[PDB]
Amino acid sequence: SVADIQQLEEKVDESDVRIYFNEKSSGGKISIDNASYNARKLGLAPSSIDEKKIKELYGDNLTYEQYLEYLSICVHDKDNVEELIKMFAHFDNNCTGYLTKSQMKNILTTWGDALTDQEAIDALNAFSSEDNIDYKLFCEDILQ
């Protein structure tokens, strides 16, 4: 291969990668949506950038090897909690270390790969019972 697939298969288990493919494949191919689902089951976090890259190379349906290349793009070794915290800190106008659930929802649903309102609120409610969200703790949590 050309992609860093050996390093992927040291982080994730090849058996799981293969089993999840077989769960979702049709005619020996997997849709991008199901590839992204599998990536998430494996603990990876694809964005729209990752999906669009692979779609532009190979279309909406991936062969096994193309799916492996997609998974390699999803690894994101450079993910860094401080960069995520600083993103939310930008909106912390009063410098309290908290953002309300509504504030967090607005951020998450307005820019980037926008979540739906229900997705955002469900994620926030899963993390905290209270309205003030410690966004440092939230970022530390979501990376795990």
Binding site: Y37, R40, A45, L108, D122, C139, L143
Partner: peptide, 15 residues
Amino acid sequence: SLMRVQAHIRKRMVA
């Protein structure tokens, strides 16, 4: 960054 946050949230949604 924001897209990374959203990506990890969607990951968490699955497991």
